[PDB]
Design a protein around this ligand. Structure first.
Ligand code: G45
Ligand code: G45
Ligand code: PLG
Ligand code: PLG
Ligand code: CL
Lengths: 442, 442
């Protein structure tokens, strides 16, 4: 007593937009640092009948019947996760149920501190995430600044974490958790130093490695598991899994953290797990462990280094003047243009990126940079040679943005008036589309 | 630079469990009241490349480039939601980003009351949800009892909402929100009366219709939209969508609730939306509006009525002695067995159900009932005649549970010893499989 007509027949309107989105993805140079492209395997899971199952609780401890095959899938995923991050199942545990990054972070922070509990995080403008306690003079923007008492550390003018400032802050403020690992930070993290500062004040060390997870997994960057009490990460970014998250807890450093994190996830915050998610996370995590994915991750850094170099060679400024990882923040001050304007120009040419703050920025609307990253294009097979091309397109986009601002003015609505029908943008898009459309596409 | 082999080839281990899980679903009498079976179209969306896109914010106000087709999908979904529940886009708004029912509730409650805010919900044991402010003398089990100040109203000994008690509570406690609409409540709700009690105290009227959403949509049960300030619902239950959730807000009754709800979902709680969900929801909401889905929903109630009737005809007691909806709670007291024991017996025969509390219970460990519901089996093409058979199987299952308890004793570990290779359980399972495996299966 249902409809079994395929998507195209049952809902032609929606199937079109999806066909449209697929063509756009295929024909874009994707520089969103947090995006990737899932293979057909990960997507077969996400679309599996396994999402029919209610299975609140944990494997063997379910509030529903007929959860035998679900328990195997949840158990395999936890196994493959601890595998992927080269941690022993005796020392470290993992919750695979959090639905996304922001959920995982809120659940983990609460497990550790509770309501009114004290937390420390890097400021959004300096490269911190919303869920790291972000607030503004006007409003408590994130729940992490509201259900928790939070204080925010800004990086120095050069754009690097100021470890001195972190300690100064930790000593007077006396937090129970300090968050490190970031959303738009282009440098590696001295976890050892964070561990030192947390030991001094008896605070938990929280590392959110969502942006850099693959590096940590493949031993290319610093390992937070050596020092951290809690490690969280999303599965959809550099990891190239589905949209989901993981919470890792150090059992050895903190006995009875296992129960705290698990009860924070359920039943404190969530109800029934998304089994298609967990199934997909399991599938991707097998690929994470292979030396083949290590190759991909290395290529990401190789492309990121090269792209940084090519942009500097074209007199484009970078925050910290380079990158240790997959991402770069371009400081657009010398061009007197905003990230918002550059995002529009790039969207007009099929270049996906996002506006990003810089250390000097005081206002989150009207920001002075864009952020870029290599994981997506690296997935499509682009090598270091290709990075000069991406740099060239970004350069030309910056120039067109300068010209269009000259003609139409500083207002964004005024600025957009210039984009349709622009002869250079059309030639540039044609260039982008031509090259993008040819690349391997999962 | 990816591996594109199909799931069977790339991950043989995992593909087996999913093929294992698939066979189990086909060969089960699924009586889990909150479960359903999604068609091929809904599952094609969930596995679509649209989940690659980061699109924080709201349509036309994205923090990323490349969101033109994503904006059309999100807009279509909100339109179809408002259509499905016969509300004008002028009076009512909808957020389609919440990742699941529990997330939606916490988000909507915070929008309305903030941290420390006062809320009223039905107690879990009386059929309320965990997110309705659930706690115990020992621990604040849900965040909704921790980040909020909560008070819990119980139903009467017959199992019905005691409206008198609700008012008595509201006058003393003076809540900012009163929650109605429940997880395991087998009767319809007097929203109008909830509205009068909310008005006396100046509290918001929160209706969570996750279990009964299809009824509301098809005008078969009371419409909470006539009275409620906020309406939340999951998309995966009777609605037969993907696993996701919807927050509905009355703009006319409460101007600027739109901004409050929307900022609660983002950036208060979530980050990037799950676009594959949003797409799947859209596809399902089309189906919801059709007269054909009304037919299905009508069959759900007709089956539930018949199943209730047949169980009473075999001298099995029901909470409230019947049902107004898709769900029945069976009072197992006269058999001197637990719901937990019956769950295992039913799991052993391929009957999916869950243990449930009854009014008399004072302990969530060792509850006195099972809850059952018709949406899944109704979806599979079972009609009223079939309900006698289901009733027969449950009856026989209760009997076998009584015998097994008699032999092996009251301890659950002891009880389970009796299940494998039991002649009548084998014969019952075979009866269950022969029938279930033959039915239509999306
Ligand atoms: C959207 C988001 N989430 N977490 C993120 C972002 C980024 C961000 C960039 C920019 C810019 N330009 C602006 C934002 C804001 C998001 C939400 C607000 S607000 O809540 O509405 N309120 C403070 C005005 S401001 C956030 C990036 C990665 C997109 C950001 C950056 N840069 C970082 N660090 O972390
Ligand atoms: C699991 C869950 N979530 N929300 C639900 C359920 C149901 C429930 C049933 C039963 C039984 N028997 C037990 C529970 C509990 C879940 C979690 C706890 S606890 O928080 O960890 N702590 C009190 C022990 S108690 C919850 C049903 C629908 C399964 C329930 C019921 N009955 C209702 N009303 O609402
Ligand atoms: C460090 C960090 N942590 C958590 C999240 C939350 O993930 P969800 O969006 O799945 O909630 C993000 C996403 N930040 C957005 C970006 O970098 O583009 C992040 O960068
Ligand atoms: C009324 C109600 N509200 C919210 C939720 C939360 O949904 P998620 O599981 O997607 O968090 C449930 C789950 N109900 C559990 C059951 O009846 O089986 C529910 O019954
Ligand atoms: Cl999903």
């Amino acid at each position: 007593m249902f409809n079994n007509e395929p998507l195209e027949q049952i809902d032609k309107e929606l199937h079109d937009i999806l066909a449209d989105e697929e063509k756009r993805q295929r024909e874009t140079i994707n520089l969103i640092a947090s995006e990737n492209l899932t293979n057909g395997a990960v997507r077969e899971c996400l679309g599996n009948r396994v999402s029919n199952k209610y299975s609140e609780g944990y494997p063997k401890k379910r509030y529903y019947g007929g959860n035998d095959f679900i328990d195997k899938i949840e158990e395999l995923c936890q196994k493959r996760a601890l595998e992927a991050f080269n941690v022993s199942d005796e020392e470290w545990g993992v919750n695979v149920q959090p639905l996304s990054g922001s959920a995982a972070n809120v659940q983990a922070l609460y497990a550790l501190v509770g309501v009114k509990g004290k937390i420390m995080g890097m400021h959004l403008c300096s490269g911190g995430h919303l869920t790291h306690g972000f607030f503004d003079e006007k409003k408590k923007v994130s729940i992490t600044s509201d259900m928790f008492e939070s204080k925010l550390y800004k990086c120095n003018s050069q754009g690097y974490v100021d470890l001195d400032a972190v300690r100064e802050m930790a000593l007077s403020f006396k937090p129970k958790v300090i968050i490190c690992g970031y959303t738009s930070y282009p440098r590696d993290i001295d976890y050892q130093q964070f561990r030192q500062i947390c030991d001094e004040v008896n605070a938990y060390l929280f590392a959110d490695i969502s942006h850099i997870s693959s590096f940590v997994a493949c031993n290319i960057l610093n390992n937070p598991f050596l020092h951290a009490d809690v490690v969280t990460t999303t599965t959809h970014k550099i990891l190239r899994g589905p949209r989901s998250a993981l919470i890792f807890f150090n059992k050895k450093r903190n006995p009875g953290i296992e129960q705290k994190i698990n009860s924070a996830v359920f039943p404190s915050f969530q109800g029934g797990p998304h089994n298609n998610k967990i199934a997909a996370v399991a599938c991707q995590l097998k690929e994470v462990h292979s030396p083949a994915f290590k190759e991909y991750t290395q290529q990401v850094l190789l492309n990121s280094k090269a792209l940084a170099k090519a942009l500097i060679s074209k007199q484009i400024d970078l925050v910290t003047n380079g990158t240790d990882n997959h991402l770069i923040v371009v400081d657009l001050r010398k061009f007197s243009i905003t990230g918002s304007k550059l995002q529009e120009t790039c969207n007009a040419i099929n270049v996906s990126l996002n506006k990003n703050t810089i250390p000097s920025d005081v206002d989150c609307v009207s920001p002075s940079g864009v952020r870029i990253g290599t994981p997506a294009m690296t997935t499509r097979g682009a090598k270091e040679k290709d990075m000069e091309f991406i740099a060239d397109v970004l350069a030309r986009a910056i120039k067109i943005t300068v010209d269009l601002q000259e003609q139409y003015g500083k207002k964004l609505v005024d600025f957009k008036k210039g984009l349709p029908g622009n002869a250079q943008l059309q030639q540039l898009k044609q260039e982008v589309v031509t090259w993008a459309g040819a690349l391997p596409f999962p």
